[PDB]
Structure formats: structure tokens, C-alpha cells
Design a protein around this nucleic acid. Structure first.
Ligand SMILES: [Mg+2]
Ligand SMILES: [Mg+2]
Ligand SMILES: [Mg+2]
Ligand SMILES: [Mg+2]
Ligand SMILES: [Mg+2]
Ligand SMILES: [Mg+2]
Ligand SMILES: [Mg+2]
Ligand SMILES: [Mg+2]
Ligand SMILES: [Mg+2]
Ligand SMILES: [Mg+2]
Ligand SMILES: [Mg+2]
Ligand SMILES: [Mg+2]
Ligand SMILES: [Mg+2]
Ligand SMILES: [Mg+2]
Ligand SMILES: [Mg+2]
Ligand SMILES: [Mg+2]
Ligand SMILES: [Mg+2]
Ligand SMILES: [Mg+2]
Ligand SMILES: [Mg+2]
Ligand SMILES: [Mg+2]
Ligand SMILES: [Mg+2]
Ligand SMILES: [Mg+2]
Lengths: 259, 141, 100, 116
RNA sequence: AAAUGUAAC
RNA sequence: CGCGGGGUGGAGCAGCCUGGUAGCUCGUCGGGCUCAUAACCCGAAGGUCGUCGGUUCAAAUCCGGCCCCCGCAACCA
């Protein structure tokens, strides 16, 4: 079946993996460490530079947060299906009865888009307004203009200063604060875009919701997206699993392809 | 762009622009040359704009020789200061060029290509220029 | 310079370093040229005055180490982008006095 | 360097002193002192130069000692390392060679513990 | 004169 | 744009002035106590001294140029 119709960017780029604890407390954080070890056992299984750049360990172990940069070819395309809540059903490390508690953890997967650092004050979009200042100074305030008042036409930010006497000392601070808002307003719209995206992938439903559940009683590793249940927790929650994501990747082609 | 990697002194007196060139007045590498018809301090900005003008015309191929080098620092006092308080800061570097110098040379390129590339490069320079081709007079030097 | 260098076929440029050569010879014996086979030159290979086949009665008057031709890489717009974004370190001033 | 390249301990019985030679152990000590007929209990300070050169001449010709012995053992290891056999590999990685366990121990070959 | 141990008998 | 103060392990500071040895606290790692965590105990690891230079036999240190950061100054019309 000609798998050669739909296009996608980002599939080959590099991805961030943000794994956090969810429902469960200290034992939930424990399983967040079990999940990361899996994405580190499997990222070695195709030779991918998995860097650790932020984490917060749990008291009894694991990771309350753990944020990683997984570099290589095809990183995001392989792992984009790991985003959501992964549920556990096991006997905790913090109980001597052997009663089973159902906890969950969360995983975020973001491809990096050639990041930032780019804009710098170019004149075609700046209308500069000059005129006379306002306040003390004598006959010089009256005569010499010296109050620079710039207007950034595309973004609308208008920072306007009169502090030093020369409009050119005033030109300096006017330019040096327009940038501090051209950068502030872009860094907002990008981190406002970083919280609207991340809030969806993790899903507040980290009690029990989206992706997978891992049975430690009978070993039923199941993905509720399709259905496929199996006993490969030994071979998956203790190593790689690049072949058991294939149906989640294959059933997601025929999801888009057949319609 | 072009500027010395290091120097003995940061700042240099302005000097003068008398006379025809001391040397560099004959084609020495390529097939065609761009000769300066009037004196000036040629900025590294102007040099590099002429260069980019030529490679972007050739698109791929040819060889350009830049025979002038901006080693002379250019000094300017900050805007709105008064006279005195020392010499201004170095803002750039220039190549002193006098009438008769071969500034650029091209090779590996057709005549019409060489004529056109050097013409466009002449438009990037603050002086009148003349296009020349290698001669026996040049080879005899 | 007889022949077309293979480097030229690959896009290069034949830099004709010497278009003549200095020679001791008799006036009755003056050749009109000296042929040079440059077709073997890649980017970037070079020929020297030692590689010159001299006709009878003519003697090389420069060091045979003297290079006479070279095939160089061509100008390329693809390099402009890296050259424009290439940052230059500001010139260092050579120290005088208790600094040197 | 009295015998045989090494200056054997004086004040000690000749049989024990001879063991301070690379290639001569206690076994070869009782051997050379018989075939030269020298009392094994006598001290090296009490040897006769007759007995010295007697013990010397025999010992330096019967067995390979010191430098030449070190040269062979190394070449024997140099060969195993070059022919690329399993015995060689262990010598190249400095790991135990006689089938010893390496999950623990192996410290004489591996050297003091490198922390992680 | 010495803290804590969540969440499925 | 002036003036004078700073950049030293992961974090925060000392070391300069009288040049040759980079130290303190927390932290990181390995081991113990405990049923387990903290705390506590034992041991260990960790620094281009912002750079580009060079003074000197020798620079974290002294002396210049640059890149950041901190405080002050910017008045009479
Ligand atoms: Mg958080
Ligand atoms: Mg007012
Ligand atoms: Mg007044
Ligand atoms: Mg006025
Ligand atoms: Mg002057
Ligand atoms: Mg000028
Ligand atoms: Mg000037
Ligand atoms: Mg003024
Ligand atoms: Mg004035
Ligand atoms: Mg002045
Ligand atoms: Mg000036
Ligand atoms: Mg300039
Ligand atoms: Mg000139
Ligand atoms: Mg012109
Ligand atoms: Mg000359
Ligand atoms: Mg021995
Ligand atoms: Mg202090
Ligand atoms: Mg300090
Ligand atoms: Mg510990
Ligand atoms: Mg400095
Ligand atoms: Mg030191
Ligand atoms: Mg006053």
C-alpha cells in the first residue's frame, strides 16, 4: 500500500522529552524514573544523544520532573505517540501489605524548531518623532527640541524618553528600550505558545486517561489508542520497544490514509 | 571583511593624496583590471561590496584578485562631542588609492563577463574607474 | 599552455602564473613559444619551471622550483552566505613598553 | 653485579640469595649448588672467588635469566597479542587470562578500583 | 533535650 | 558618554594589593545508621580564574585592548 502520499515536517528533527510524576505521590515519581530509563534504553538502541538538562528527583527515588534532549535522525517521528498519561497498576515500593495502587505519569514530546535569537532593530519599520521636551531647563527647553519619541509601526510598541538633554543621548535610550519590548513581546508570544501546547499533551487527566496502562499483576502492557494488549512488559519496561510502537505508527497511517 | 589581523599602532594620521600611484599600476594576475581614475580612501565596506558584486555576477566560476588592502584606520569622534578631548575612535579601515592603481583583477571568465562584472563593481566605488585588459606593456613590467 | 586542465572541466580556473619564462639562449636560436601540457592538472595542482620541456639550445634562467601555473577553485555564490556571517576578531595592537 | 647481573644479598645463605635472580627459584637454587659442589648453607660473604666463578659459570649457561628471560616472556605475550587469539586479547585489555571470574575481584590484573 | 512514611483488606 | 567597583569548581564567597600553594560553606558521587527517607557518620570527586594577548625565569594575581555586570554622575540656561 503506497505509504507515499502524506507529508510531515518535524519527523526527523530533534525532540525534548519532559517526563513528570502524576497521581500517586512518591511512588508515582518512582515510575517516572522507570519511564525515562526506557526512553534512555531505547534511545541507545538506535544511537541517539539523550542529554539531561533539567530534573527534580523524588524523595524515595525516580523523578518529579525530568527533561531531556534526544538528538538524532527520526527522533520526533518515532516518539510523538508517547505524549499523554501512562498509567501503572502495581504493588508500590512503599507498602508492605502488597495492596495495588493505580498511579499515572506524564510525558511531553516537543520537536525543536531551530530555536530563537533573530530580530534586531531595522529602520524601515520605525517612524521617529522629534519635538520639544517638557519641564525644567530654561530657554533651552523652550528652543531646542531634544525629545525623541519613536513609534515601532509593525508591533505598535511606542517607548518614548526625555531624560538626558540631547536628543541623541535620548535617541540611545529610546532605541535601547524598544528592543527590550520587541524582545519581551516576542518571548511572551513564544512562551504563551509553549504553555498552550504543553497543557494539551500532558493532559490534566493524569489520574487515568490517555495513552497506556502497564499491568504489573499479569503483565498486560496495553495501549488504549488501538487496543493491542501483550505481555512484553519484561521486554519493554526493562529495555527497548521500537517494534511495539509500530502498530501505533502503522494504525496511525491508515487512520489518516484511508479517510 | 578586510582589516589587519594586528597592528603596531591603533590610530594613524590622515596624510595626503598627492600624485599618481606609487605602484600596482599594471595588470599582474588576471586578464582584466579595474583601474582607479581619481584618488580616495576606499573603505573595506566598498571593497567587499565590489567583490560580492563580482562573484554574484559570475554566479559560479572565475577568479577575482583584490590588489588593494585597507590597513589605514579611520577615526571618528562620537556624535555631538566638542572639539578636543583626544582623537576619535576607530570606526573602520580604508585603503589609500591614487589615480592609476589596479584595484581588482579577474580571470577564468569571458570578456563580456569580465567587462560587466568590473563595471558593476565600479558602481560600488566612490571614484571614477576604467576597465583595462592585460597587455604586453603589463607583461613587460 | 596546451590542453584543457581536468580541473577546469570540474569548474576550476587555470591561473597562468608565468606567461613567459626567463631564458639564456642565442639570438640565432630564439624560439617563438614553449608548449606546456596542463591538461593533467586537477584542483588544485601546479606546474613548475622544472616541468618545462626546453627546446635545443635554450637554458632555464630561473630556479626550477619557480611555479609557473596552477588550477584554482572558482568563485562561488554558495560561499557568500558563510563569508557575510563570518565574524572577524577585532585587530590586536602590538604591545609597547612594560607590555611586549 | 657479582652474579649473574644482580648483586645477590650477602650475609645470606647462598641458596636463598640465588633466588633473588629473575629466573632462579628455590628449586634451581638447590640444583646449581649440587652441580658446583658448594655448601648451600654457606653465606655469600663466605664464598671463595673460586666458588663464585664456579657457581657463576654454571648458572649463567644452564638457564635463561634476567633480561633475556624478560625479553622472551614479553615476546611470548607480544606474539599472542599479535596473532589475535583470545589469550592475546586478555593481555591487550589487561584482563585476566586464565579463565578467572571478572564480575568481582580480578584486581591484580585490573588494578585498584576506578570509581564511577 | 531526636522529624517524616501519600494513594485500591 | 564620564568616574570606580566586579567576573574564581554546580550555587554563593575568599585567594590579588607584598607574583610561584587556588581555599571555605552548601551541593554532587561512593559507603554506613534506620524497616525506609531526612537528619547524622565515613571517605572521595569537582575550577579555560570572562576573554585576546605579554610583563617576568614564572600571572588567578602585575600591566594594556575588548566583552559582559554592579553603583554613582549627567549640572547653569
Ligand atoms: Mg513543575
Ligand atoms: Mg510640565
Ligand atoms: Mg534658568
Ligand atoms: Mg539651541
Ligand atoms: Mg590631519
Ligand atoms: Mg570616507
Ligand atoms: Mg578621520
Ligand atoms: Mg556637546
Ligand atoms: Mg559648542
Ligand atoms: Mg581631538
Ligand atoms: Mg577622529
Ligand atoms: Mg568606516
Ligand atoms: Mg594606491
Ligand atoms: Mg564609481
Ligand atoms: Mg617591480
Ligand atoms: Mg624470582
Ligand atoms: Mg567576601
Ligand atoms: Mg569576588
Ligand atoms: Mg548517600
Ligand atoms: Mg582584563
Ligand atoms: Mg597559578
Ligand atoms: Mg547650581
Amino acid at each position: 500500500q503506497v505509504l507515499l502520499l502524506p507529508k510531515d515536517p518535524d519527523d526527523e528533527r530533534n525532540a525534548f522529552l519532559e517526563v513528570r510524576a502524576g497521581t500517586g505521590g512518591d511512588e508515582a515519581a518512582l515510575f517516572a524514573g522507570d519511564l525515562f530509563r526506557m526512553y534512555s534504553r531505547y534511545a541507545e538502541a538506535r544511537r541517539w544523544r539523550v542529554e539531561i538538562m533539567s530534573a527534580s528527583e523524588g524523595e524515595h527515588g525516580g523523578y518529579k520532573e525530568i527533561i531531556a534532549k534526544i538528538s538524532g535522525d527520526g527522533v520526533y517521528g518515532r516518539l510523538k505517540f508517547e505524549s499523554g498519561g501512562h498509567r501503572v497498576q502495581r504493588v508500590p515500593a512503599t507498602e508492605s501489605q502488597g495492596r495495588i495502587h493505580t498511579s499515572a505519569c506524564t510525558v511531553a514530546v516537543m520537536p525543536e524548531l531551530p530555536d530563537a535569537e533573530l530580530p534586531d532593530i531595522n529602520p524601515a519599520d520605525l517612524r521617529i518623532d522629534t519635538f520639544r521636551s517638557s519641564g525644567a531647563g530654561g530657554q533651552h527647553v523652550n528652543t531646542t527640541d531634544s525629545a525623541i519619541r519613536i513609534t515601532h509601526l509593525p508591533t505598535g510598541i511606542v517607548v518614548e524618553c526625555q531624560d538626558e538633554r540631547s536628543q541623541h543621548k535620548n535617541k540611545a535610550k529610546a532605541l535601547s528600550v524598544l528592543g527590550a519590548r520587541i524582545h519581551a513581546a516576542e518571548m511572551a508570544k513564544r512562551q504563551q505558545a509553549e504553555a498552550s501546547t504543553r497543557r494539551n499533551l500532558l493532559g490534566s487527566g493524569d489520574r487515568s486517561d490517555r495513552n497506556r496502562t502497564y499491568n504489573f499483576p499479569q503483565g498486560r502492557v496495553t495501549d488504549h489508542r488501538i487496543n493491542l494488549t501483550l505481555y512484553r512488559l519484561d521486554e519493554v519496561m526493562e529495555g527497548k520497544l521500537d517494534m511495539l510502537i509500530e502498530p501505533i505508527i502503522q494504525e496511525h497511517q491508515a487512520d489518516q490514509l484511508a479517510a | 571583511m578586510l582589516m589587519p589581523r594586528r597592528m603596531k599602532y591603533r590610530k594613524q594620521q590622515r596624510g595626503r593624496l598627492k600624485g599618481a600611484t606609487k605602484g600596482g599600476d599594471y595588470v599582474a594576475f588576471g586578464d582584466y583590471g579595474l583601474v582607479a581614475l581619481e584618488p580616495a580612501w576606499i573603505t573595506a565596506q566598498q571593497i567587499e561590496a565590489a567583490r560580492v558584486a563580482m562573484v554574484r555576477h559570475f554566479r559560479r566560476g572565475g577568479k577575482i584578485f583584490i590588489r588593494i588592502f585597507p590597513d589605514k584606520p579611520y577615526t571618528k569622534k562620537p556624535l555631538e562631542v566638542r572639539m578636543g578631548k583626544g582623537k576619535g575612535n576607530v570606526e573602520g579601515y580604508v585603503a589609500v588609492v591614487k589615480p592609476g592603481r589596479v584595484m581588482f583583477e579577474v580571470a577564468g571568465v569571458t570578456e563580456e563577463q569580465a567587462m560587466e562584472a568590473l563595471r558593476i563593481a565600479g558602481h560600488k566605488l566612490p571614484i571614477k574607474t576604467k576597465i583595462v585588459r592585460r597587455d604586453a606593456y603589463d607583461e613587460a613590467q | 599552455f596546451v590542453g584543457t586542465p581536468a580541473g577546469v572541466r570540474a569548474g576550476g580556473v587555470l591561473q597562468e602564473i608565468h606567461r613567459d619564462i626567463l631564458v639564456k639562449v642565442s639570438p640565432r636560436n630564439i624560439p617563438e613559444f614553449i608548449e606546456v601540457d596542463v591538461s593533467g592538472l586537477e584542483i588544485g595542482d601546479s606546474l613548475h619551471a622544472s616541468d618545462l620541456k626546453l627546446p635545443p639550445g635554450v637554458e632555464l634562467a630561473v630556479s626550477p622550483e619557480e611555479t609557473i601555473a596552477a588550477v584554482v577553485p572558482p568563485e562561488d555564490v554558495e560561499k557568500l552566505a558563510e563569508e557575510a556571517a563570518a565574524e572577524v576578531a577585532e585587530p590586536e595592537v602590538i604591545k609597547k613598553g612594560k607590555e611586549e | 653485579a657479582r652474579i649473574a647481573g644482580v648483586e645477590i644479598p650477602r650475609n645470606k645463605r647462598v641458596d636463598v640469595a640465588l633466588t633473588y635472580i629473575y629466573g632462579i627459584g628455590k628449586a634451581r637454587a638447590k640444583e646449581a649448588l649440587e652441580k658446583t659442589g658448594i655448601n648451600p648453607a654457606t653465606r655469600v660473604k663466605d664464598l671463595t672467588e673460586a666458588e663464585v666463578v664456579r657457581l657463576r659459570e654454571y648458572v649463567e649457561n644452564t638457564w635463561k635469566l634476567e633480561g633475556e628471560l624478560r625479553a622472551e616472556v614479553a615476546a611470548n605475550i607480544k606474539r599472542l597479542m599479535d596473532i589475535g587469539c583470545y589469550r592475546g586479547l586478555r593481555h591487550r585489555r589487561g584482563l585476566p587470562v586464565r579463565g578467572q571470574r571478572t564480575r568481582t575481584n580480578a584486581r591484580t590484573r585490573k588494578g585498584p578500583r576506578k570509581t564511577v
